[PDB]
């Protein structure tokens, strides 16, 4: 009874967050492209400093 209740408590949350995989895919793609640009700017900054 308690385990069934706990499953029926978690399952709605699992269904609610499962649809976010695509929004997360576009979010990570933009964020990783942004991190590549951050790394490039840090490298070019450190290169010119000397």
């Amino acid at each position: 009874w308690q385990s069934a209740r706990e499953l029926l408590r978690d399952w709605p949350s699992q269904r609610h967050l499962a649809d976010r995989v695509q929004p997360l895919r576009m979010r990570l793609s933009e964020l990783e492209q942004r991190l590549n640009n951050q790394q490039n700017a840090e490298r070019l900054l450190s290169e010119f400093c000397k």
Partner: protein, 49 residues
Amino acid sequence: LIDRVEEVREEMDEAQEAARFLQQHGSALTKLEPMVAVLQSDPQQHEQL
């Protein structure tokens, strides 16, 4: 130095696992939700009750 790509990847792992679990047990959970209350009463325990 946000370093949030890892957090977004952990959210993806949890969300893809939630989607995979939904495909694996959705039929079982949907068949369980209309009669969950029966689990509180076991056949021998009904006499002791």
